[PDB]
Write a protein that binds this ligand. Sequence first.
Ligand SMILES: Nc1ccc(S(=O)(=O)NC(=O)c2ccccc2)cc1
Ligand SMILES: Nc1ccc(S(=O)(=O)NC(=O)c2ccccc2)cc1
Length: 164
Amino acid sequence: GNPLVYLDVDANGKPLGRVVLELKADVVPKTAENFRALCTGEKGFGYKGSTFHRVIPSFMCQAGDFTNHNGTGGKSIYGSRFPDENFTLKHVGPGVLSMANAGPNTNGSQFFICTIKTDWLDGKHVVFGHVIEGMDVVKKIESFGSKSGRTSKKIVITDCGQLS
Ligand SMILES: Nc1ccc(S(=O)(=O)NC(=O)c2ccccc2)cc1
Ligand SMILES: Nc1ccc(S(=O)(=O)NC(=O)c2ccccc2)cc1
């Protein structure tokens, strides 16, 4: 079946717990596979040790820039960027996992977890999964954001990987 992966998250060195994500490989196999491999680190790089660098309350929590840690970087397992696979899954509500980008066909490694329905992103960001467990952790992360996106605590993915 579809992969289950996890992110274990600290805030200022205090563990918040685990976010478990189901990746919709049946709908977006290429996008799901990229994220899965970045969680395991099996290509020699990935999310372990990186941060949630931009968090906006009542919107989303963004992470995945494991090279520049500021929204400019990241890379996929395929190359620096890869195309939008499809827009079949929609930004339906809290817990949606979707690709951050810099316009059409600029997927790398950055992603966001929604804390609300974000319908205006439909057709612009590739949705590829959703939170299975740990929305409480996501709400903690969200609470350390601000309108500007600046975080008020250092939010670190201390560990990540694949469960099944
Ligand atoms: N990942 C991601 C996707 C889209 C955008 S955005 O279009 O530049 N800003 C908002 O969508 C928004 C909505 C509510 C409050 C603040 C910002 C930003 C990050
Ligand atoms: N790096 C990067 C990240 C996101 C984007 S975007 O979402 O396609 N456009 C804007 O964010 C934006 C905001 C205000 C004015 C003009 C554009 C583009 C590049």
